[PDB]
Every structure is written in structure tokens, then in C-alpha cells.
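From the methods appendix. Each design record in this collection lists the discretized structure first, followed by the designed amino acid sequence. Records were kept in a plain field format so they could be parsed without special tools. The example shown here is representative of the layout used throughout.

RECORD:
C-ALPHA CELLS (862 positions):
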């Protein structure tokens, strides 16, 4: 065994040894239980950084742990190669989108392979190749036939910098998720996935996700934004139906999320476009002056009345500016004693306020809005007839019973969520499989003629959709009539691919469907998913929707894609930038910046070392490829070795917690790896290997007994930490503690060396998921078997039994007590414990003499 710890020697070798054994290349093996552990795959938007190390070392640790426990482990990796992140990274580097993506993919494969991750590279996938995206083209056409995908004009979010429309999930604080520019409103046709159709299931199936962080689940609940309301009809009075036709003559329909207040409505409000507004203004020009005014909070009375269904009150109808014709009903009711928006409006014109809710008994002031009025949680109903005394839940159902039995209403559910707009005016994206024919309409491309192949030799000129200036691409024949027609030039958003790729990993070479039935039946769902919480509202919602879509088609048979979700905390570091002449920002790596400090130690100035000219200091921020603040793992592997990169990131903090970059933390992770190497080498220099201690330990010294206790305690604690707590920093700390006691333990005797062997064989296996290169090498110097067949270390709980004795206690001869003591518990602690529990102190004045038998009995004399 060499004595210097040289990563560049042992690390490539260990990777070659794992690769040759094909340990990470798994198939649908029914003899082993399956474990699908997946980390969120990267965009080719630059170099990987130490945040990615943390992300994927977490995954690798969980996979390697389950592999050592006999599981059949699939840990795949691929590339989110389509869409905006790879294209923008390509144009900022003035490279063709295809050329850049394929080059960055190979650099990221190089970067990841130097880290020794146990990845099944035979399932590698690049979402920009036709053999991938043809299958989402196929799913598009099928859904389009059913109308689950549809095209429609409407108001959309427009990113002026990326020159494309985004989905509502791609707008972050009114700005583009990639550009950061303010989003404008525009009316553009778009292809939508009808995600509102699945709004109820996506909300209710979050209750199934017991191993998801509750933040992700509540954030998706608030994004789906469910509200249970009530459709309510107020009949038009027998003397206001002038000019009204159809249903608009007989009733005024409104919506309300507070149907419990219905007995308190004192007037209604109507839209200028609502038909009762037009017949009321037909002979009243001042009403048409308001109808022309907007079409702030203003309103006019109309003198036409509608009847409350629940008590027969005749309420006056108001033209109001806050009733946007597009409400669904275009009209509301107004309970001003319990809605702030309505109390303000009905103080503007002195309308009445009847109170119908009491909270405990907060006194009711008619012209003084108190916050308890809108309490939908701690209130019971007042002045409401047989609805008196009900709470909000019970009064909801009772109003629905009332309204439905007379037909005047019914519950109606609304969602803040809107359909998913996936069209993009961009080149580097999966082509949309539609052909517009002047005779047949928007027709899908037949399954036999898929994929519609995106040409890869294009460079965007940065001036609109490049495919739309390419008649060689869009001029085609109609699939239905043979006539001339044009291809859809918009492409699919990048979140299409990432919504199903976890299935593609199960059969990436399958050429007849999205995923083959035999492999989807085997791999089931992703057992473990690891990725940042920033995906809560977009990807982690999209992927549940797609999974349900694929299930309803018969491709998969799971309801949810990811059983366990671990959201790792962000590695953060400094970030700098300049402002470019295009109004944007040019981000700069802290390694190209030279700082100037204050007298107190604060950075004051920062200049780029290339030109000495200043740069702006942006402060600590998440390590990001798009903000050019990453620490490259290859620059650490070359200097310190891959294991040090891995050990530092699993040790600095618990996986969920924020981690700040520091050079001290890298040196420390290395000195421990030297300590591990030095420990195994020194043990081997003074004797060589021996058969690890096992079996009964009667006869071992107390000191080595204590060590075996520390040993199997640690194995138990590391096992609990990998596979229940999923806390890796504390698994590493426990092994250090084990090594601390080993350093303090004389292990030179024949039995001591057998215990040293047992400890070291255990330690390197315990740390193999975290630092596999150094452990695999050390294991081979200690033991000739294959590490992954020796398996995960077992806890020998015989070694956990404490070394104790139970001595007799007597008073003047006759036995009256029994006490527990340590093995080497001195006669003073013995005699003190003997004269300190029941039998001796209840039959005792002090003792005249205490004769002690060494480790047998102690007799009190009185
Ligand atoms: N600083 C970081 N710390 C921890 N995890 C990170 C960090 N940056 C990215 N990740 C995670 O790595 C995975 C891949 O992210 P991605 O490919 O978007 O890289 P990125 O650094 O975010 O690049 P970009 O800024 O262009 O999006 C995701 O699970 C993401 O949450
Ligand atoms: C699963 C995907 C949405 C993750 C992206 N490729 C990186 O954030
Ligand atoms: Mg990202
Ligand atoms: Mg369950
Ligand atoms: Zn046609």
C-alpha cells in the first residue's frame, strides 16, 4: 500500500473498476428489489458548479447506500437540452444552438464522470434528439384530437427580451424566468394543455405525497388556487323585465364564495355589458353615459329590482365599474356588512348593511368596518332564518340545499389556475406537430410521419421566430387533402420534455412508445427525487399532470411520479456583474474579480483583473450557471480530488440547509481523507491484515469492548442517518467520533488487531456512499472481497450490551438490597451506591464498617 493519499491515482482506477464491473448498469431484474433514485437533470447552460456537486452527491449517496443493501438501483442522468436555457447560453456565446448543446453535454458528462457518480450511462438521454422528442410530438397529437391540447387566441404573457410568450409559471415577480425583464400583455394565439381539467385531482393527490416537503405541497395548493363558491340566481321582479330576452328576463345570476351571507345582501351590482344594463340604459341616457364611461370604484342605481331567493327581499341592481364582464356571470351580490370591498362601496352611496354573522360576540358597529366581519372561521349565522347558528362549513351546505331544492342555485368551484400555454416563438425547441391547411384547418401530423424533424443547422439572428422565416421547413403538404399548407413554426417549451423524462429513463431505446410497458411496470414510480424547491410551482406540478395524462392514455399506471422528494439547500457564493450597453447584465466569476477592502474589513471596490476596470458587487447569492458565479468541480478535483469535493458538500450542512462557499471547508474535508488513509496505512504497516473480529466477545478487554460498542452504535447511527433522516453531515460526524475512540484505543494485541480490522472494514463501507474512491481503495487493502458484495455493515447488538454487574446488599448480615453498578465501579462508588437505595437505607444511624467482597457482595455493619 502506497502511503501518500493521491486522488489522481486511486480515483480514475476506482472508476475504471466500477465501470468494468458494470455495477451501475441495471435492467428489469425481478430477482432484486427495485430502487429508482433520480436527481433533477441539468440544462446545458454552462459549466457545472459545486451546487450541482451537492445536488448529485446527495443522490449518489442515497443510491450507493441502497445498492449496498441489495437493492437493484437505477440512477440515471441525462440532459434538458431543449428550450430556452440551452439556446440563450448558445447565443450569448455566439454558437449554433445544436453545436453548443452537444458540446456542453459532453463537457458536463466529463465533469460528472470525474465525480464517480454511480450513474447508469446506458440510459443516458438527450432531449434534443428526435428519438426523444418524437414521443412528445406523438402525445401532443393524441391529446389534440381529444381537445386536451388546443389552440386559442387570448391574452398572454410576453417576454420582450427573450422575444417569446411564457407560461404563467415562467413569470416570476412579473419578470421572465430567464431574462428578468418586465412581462408585457399581448394577444397571441397559443397551444394550451388543458391543465384546469385535472385541477381537482392534482390538488387532492397531494394528500398522497406523504414524503414530500409540505412547503412544495402548500405552494402547489396555493398555485392551483381552489375556491368553493355558489351560483345564485335572483329572480327579476315582475316589473323590470322590459326589453330583456331569454334567461336574462327571468333571473340575475351571480357568483359568491360567501353564500353563508346570502340573507344579508342589500343590493346587487351588474356589468355595463350585462343585458340588464342595456335594457335599463335603453331609455336612460345617464346609464349609457356610465356604460360609455369605463367600457377606483363607482356605480349608478338602475331602479330595476331582483328578488333574493332565500327570503324574498327586493334588492336594487347597480351598474358598477368593478364588475368586469368576464366574471362568468358578469354580476355580483353585495353583502356590505361582511365584505370590505362591499362595505366601502355601500358607504359611498349609503346602502344598508344587515349583519348575519356573529363572531363570539364582538359588538357590531354599523358604520365601522371591523376585521371580524370577514371571519370565515369563527362565526355563526344571525338573522338568517333556519340558517341561524350554523358555522361557515355547515351553512355552505345548507344554502346549497336551499337553493337547489328551488333551483335558484348550486355550488360552483373556481380555480386560480389557468391552462398551460406551451407555444414558443423560439427555434431551439421541439417542433409542434400541426399543419395549417386553408381547407381542413389545424390538423395534426400523422403518427407514421413523426417526428417532425427540427433542422439543427440554424443560428437565430435574434429577430423573431427563426423557423417562421424558413419556407424550406414550413412549406409542406396537408396530411388530409394533399394540398399546400404551412407547418406550425412555434416550438414547445422546455418544460414539456422535463415533464416525462423520468419515464423515458425506464426504456430510452424503446422505439414504439413513450415508455415500454414491461419496464414501466417494473420501475413503477421514482422512489427518490432530489432537486431545488424552485421547481415547486412549475416542473413538480407539470410532471404530476403529465404522469396522469400518460396514465389515462394507458402508457403508465402510476398516479404520481415521485414518492420521496428531497429539496436540497442552495450552495451560495459571491456574485458580481457589469451593466452592458444592451441594458442587461454581464455576470462575472468571483475568480476574475480583485476586491478592495476597508479599514474595518468590508469590500469597497471590485475590479476585473483583465482590465482593472470596476464591477458591481451583488452580494451572496445562489450558485448559478446563468449568473457565472460557480466554482467548477473540475478545478477542485484537479487540486484536491473528487472525494474532497463530495465530502465537503455532504459535511458542511444538513442537505436542506443553506451552504455558503468557503475554502476552509475544502481543506478540512481533505485532512480527514488524509486521516482515513493514514489510519488504514499505519494499521497495515504494523502487521498487515487479519480476519475481522466477529462472534461472541466474552474475553475481550473492557477497552476493546468499548470500541466495539462505539463501532456498532456508529453503524446503527449511520444507517439511521442515510435511510431515514437523510442527514449526511451527521453520518460523517459519527464516523469521525468512531475514529476518535479508535485513536485512543490500544489495538496492538492479537485481539486488538482483530477489532481494528473490524472497525476499519466497517468505517470504509459506512463512508463508501459519500467518498467511494478512497473507501473502495482502502477496502481492497484490508479485505480481498468485492466491497459491494460484503454489503452494508450489520449491527451486532450483542456488542451494545453494557458491561455491568449486580452486587448483593445486606444489613448486619441479612440480605436486604440489590443494586446495579459498572464493571470497574470502584468500591467507593459501590459502597456509596449500596448505601443509597431502599433495602439498606430503609433498614438502617451511619455505618460502623462496610466490608466489601471484590465484585460480589457488600455488607453494611450498624
Ligand atoms: N447553487 C445550487 N445549489 C444547489 N443545487 C443547485 C444549485 N444550482 C442549481 N442546483 C440544482 O441543480 C439542478 C439542475 O439545475 P440547473 O441545470 O438549472 O443549473 P443552474 O445552476 O440552476 O443553471 P441556470 O442558472 O442556467 O438555471 C436542480 O435540481 C437545481 O435545483
Ligand atoms: C427537471 C427539470 C425541470 C430541471 C431543470 N433541467 C434544471 O432546473
Ligand atoms: Mg436552473
Ligand atoms: Mg402513500
Ligand atoms: Zn387539407
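DESIGN:
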Amino acid at each position: 500500500m502506497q502511503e501518500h493519499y493521491q486522488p489522481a491515482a486511486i480515483e480514475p482506477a476506482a472508476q475504471k473498476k466500477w465501470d468494468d464491473a458494470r455495477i451501475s448498469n441495471v435492467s428489469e431484474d425481478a430477482s432484486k428489489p427495485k430502487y429508482y433514485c433520480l436527481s433533477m437533470f441539468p440544462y446545458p447552460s454552462g459549466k457545472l458548479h459545486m451546487g450541482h456537486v451537492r445536488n448529485y452527491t446527495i443522490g449518489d449517496v442515497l443510491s450507493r447506500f441502497k445498492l449496498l443493501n441489495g437493492f437493484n438501483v437505477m440512477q440515471p442522468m441525462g440532459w434538458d437540452a431543449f428550450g430556452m436555457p440551452a439556446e440563450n447560453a448558445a447565443m450569448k456565446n455566439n454558437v449554433a444552438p445544436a453545436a453548443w448543446t452537444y458540446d456542453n453535454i459532453e463537457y458536463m458528462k466529463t465533469q460528472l464522470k470525474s465525480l464517480g457518480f454511480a450513474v447508469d450511462w446506458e440510459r443516458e438521454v438527450a432531449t434534443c434528439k428526435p428519438e426523444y422528442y418524437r414521443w412528445e410530438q406523438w402525445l401532443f397529437t393524441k391529446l389534440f384530437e381529444k381537445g386536451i391540447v388546443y389552440r386559442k387566441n387570448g391574452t398572454v404573457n410576453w417576454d420582450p427580451v427573450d422575444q417569446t410568450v411564457l407560461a404563467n409559471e415562467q413569470v416570476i415577480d412579473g419578470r421572465g424566468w430567464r431574462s428578468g425583464a418586465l412581462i408585457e400583455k399581448r394577444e397571441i394565439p397559443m397551444y394550451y394543455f388543458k391543465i384546469t381539467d385535472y385541477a381537482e385531482e392534482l390538488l387532492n393527490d397531494l394528500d398522497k405525497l406523504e414524503h414530500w416537503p409540505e412547503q412544495v405541497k402548500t405552494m402547489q395548493r396555493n398555485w392551483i388556487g381552489k375556491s368553493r363558491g355558489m351560483t345564485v340566481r335572483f329572480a327579476v321582479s315582475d316589473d323590470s323585465k322590459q326589453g330583456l330576452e331569454g334567461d336574462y328576463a327571468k333571473f340575475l345570476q351571480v357568483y359568491t364564495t360567501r353564500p353563508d351571507t346570502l340573507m344579508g345582501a342589500t343590493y346587487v351590482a351588474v356589468a355595463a355589458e350585462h343585458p340588464l344594463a342595456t335594457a335599463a340604459a335603453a331609455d336612460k341616457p345617464e346609464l349609457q353615459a356610465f356604460i360609455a364611461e369605463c367600457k377606483e370604484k363607482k356605480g349608478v342605481p338602475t331602479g330595476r329590482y331582483v328578488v333574493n331567493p332565500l327570503n324574498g327581499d327586493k334588492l336594487e341592481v347597480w351598474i358598477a365599474n368593478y364588475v368586469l364582464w368576464g366574471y362568468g356571470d358578469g354580476a355580483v351580490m353585495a353583502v356590505p356588512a361582511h365584505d370590505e370591498r362591499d362595505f366601502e362601496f355601500a358607504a359611498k352611496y349609503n346602502l344598508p348593511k344587515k349583519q348575519v354573522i356573529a363572531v363570539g360576540d364582538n359588538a357590531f358597529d354599523a358604520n365601522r368596518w371591523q376585521e371580524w366581519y370577514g371571519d370565515k372561521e369563527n362565526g355563526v349565522l344571525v338573522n338568517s332564518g333556519d340558517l341561524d347558528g350554523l358555522d361557515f362549513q355547515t351553512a355552505f351546505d345548507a344554502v346549497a340545499a336551499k337553493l337547489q331544492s328551488q333551483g335558484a342555485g348550486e355550488p360552483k368551484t373556481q380555480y386560480r389556475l389557468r391552462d398551460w400555454g406551451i407555444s414558443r416563438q423560439r427555434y431551439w425547441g421541439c417542433p409542434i406537430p400541426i399543419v395549417h391547411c386553408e381547407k381542413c384547418g389545424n390538423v395534426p401530423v400523422p403518427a407514421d410521419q413523426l417526428p417532425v424533424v427540427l433542422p439543427e443547422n440554424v443560428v437565430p439572428d435574434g429577430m423573431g421566430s427563426p423557423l417562421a422565416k424558413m419556407p424550406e421547413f414550413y412549406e409542406t403538404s396537408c396530411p388530409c387533402c394533399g394540398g399546400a399548407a404551412k407547418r406550425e413554426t412555434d416550438t414547445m417549451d422546455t418544460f414539456i420534455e422535463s415533464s416525462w423524462y423520468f419515464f423515458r429513463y425506464m426504456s430510452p431505446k424503446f422505439s414504439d412508445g413513450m415508455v415500454s410497458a414491461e419496464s414501466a411496470k417494473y420501475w413503477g414510480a421514482v422512489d427518490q427525487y432530489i432537486g431545488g424547491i424552485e421547481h415547486a410551482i412549475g416542473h413538480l406540478l407539470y410532471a404530476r399532470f403529465f404522469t396522469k395524462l400518460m396514465r389515462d392514455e394507458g402508457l403508465v399506471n402510476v398516479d404520481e411520479p415521485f414518492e420521496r422528494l428531497l429539496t436540497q439547500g442552495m450552495v451560495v457564493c459571491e456574485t458580481y456583474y457589469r451593466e452592458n450597453d444592451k441594458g442587461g447584465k454581464d455576470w462575472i466569476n468571483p475568480a476574475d474579480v480583485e476586491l478592495t477592502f476597508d479599514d474595518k474589513g468590508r469590500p469597497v471596490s471590485a475590479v476585473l483583473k483583465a482590465d482593472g476596470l470596476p464591477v458591481v458587487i451583488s452580494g451572496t447569492e445562489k450558485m448559478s450557471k446563468s449568473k457565472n458565479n460557480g466554482v467548477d468541480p473540475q478545478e477542485l478535483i484537479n487540486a484536491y480530488g473528487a472525494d474532497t469535493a463530495r465530502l465537503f458538500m455532504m459535511f458542511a450542512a444538513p442537505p436542506e440547509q443553506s451552504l455558503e462557499w468557503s475554502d476552509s471547508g475544502v481543506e478540512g474535508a481533505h485532512r480527514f481523507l488524509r486521516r482515513l488513509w493514514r489510519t488504514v496505512y499505519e494499521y497495515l504497516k504494523q502487521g498487515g491484515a487479519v480476519k475481522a473480529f466477529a462472534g461472541n466477545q466474552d474475553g475481550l478487554s473492557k477497552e476493546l469492548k468499548d470500541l466495539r460498542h462505539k463501532l456498532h452504535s456508529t453503524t446503527a447511527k449511520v444507517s439511521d442517518d442515510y435511510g431515514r433522516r437523510q442527514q449526511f453531515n451527521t453520518a460523517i460526524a459519527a464516523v469521525m467520533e468512531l475514529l476518535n475512540q479508535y485513536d485512543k484505543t490500544d489495538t496492538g494485541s492479537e485481539q486488538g488487531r482483530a477489532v481494528a480490522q473490524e472497525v476499519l472494514e466497517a468505517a470504509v463501507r459506512l463512508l463508501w456512499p459519500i467518498v467511494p474512491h478512497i473507501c473502495e481503495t482502502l477496502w481492497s487493502e484490508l479485505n480481498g472481497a468485492k466491497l459491494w458484495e460484503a454489503g452494508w455493515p450489520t449491527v451486532d447488538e450483542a456488542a451494545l450490551v453494557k458491561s455491568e454487574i449486580e452486587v448483593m446488599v445486606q444489613v448486619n448480615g441479612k440480605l436486604r438490597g440489590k443494586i446495579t453498578v459498572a464493571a470497574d465501579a470502584s468500591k467507593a462508588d459501590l459502597e456509596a451506591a449500596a448505601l443509597a437505595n431502599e433495602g439498606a437505607v430503609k433498614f438502617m444511624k451511619p455505618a460502623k464498617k462496610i466490608i466489601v467482597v471484590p465484585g460480589r457482595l457488600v455488607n453494611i455493619v450498624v
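APPENDIX NOTE: The domain at 7-124+495-570 is CATH 3.40.50.620 (Rossmann fold).
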